Amino acid sequence: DKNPFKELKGGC
Protein backbone atom coordinates (compact mmCIF):
# COMPACT_ATOMS: atom_id res chain seq x y z
CA ASP A 1 0.00 0.00 0.00
CA LYS A 2 2.34 2.78 1.42
CA ASN A 3 4.32 1.43 4.46
CA PRO A 4 3.55 -2.25 3.24
CA PHE A 5 5.02 -1.09 -0.18
CA LYS A 6 8.09 0.26 1.78
CA GLU A 7 8.45 -3.31 3.36
CA LEU A 8 9.69 -4.60 -0.12
CA LYS A 9 12.35 -1.79 -0.27
CA GLY A 10 13.43 -2.53 3.37
CA GLY A 11 13.87 -6.28 2.67
CA CYS A 12 15.67 -5.91 -0.70
UniProtKB/Swiss-Prot annotation:
The modification Cysteine methyl ester is found at C12. It comes from the Eukaryota. A lipid is attached at C12 (S-farnesyl cysteine). Retinal rod outer segment. Transmembrane segments: none annotated. It is found in: Cell membrane. G proteins are composed of 3 units, alpha, beta and gamma. Guanine nucleotide-binding proteins (G proteins) are involved as a modulator or transducer in various transmembrane signaling systems. The beta and gamma chains are required for the GTPase activity, for replacement of GDP by GTP, and for G protein-effector interaction. Belongs to the G protein gamma family. This is Guanine nucleotide-binding protein G(T) subunit gamma-T1. It comes from Bos taurus (Bovine). The lineage of its organism: Eukaryota, Metazoa, Chordata, Craniata, Vertebrata. The gene is GNGT1.
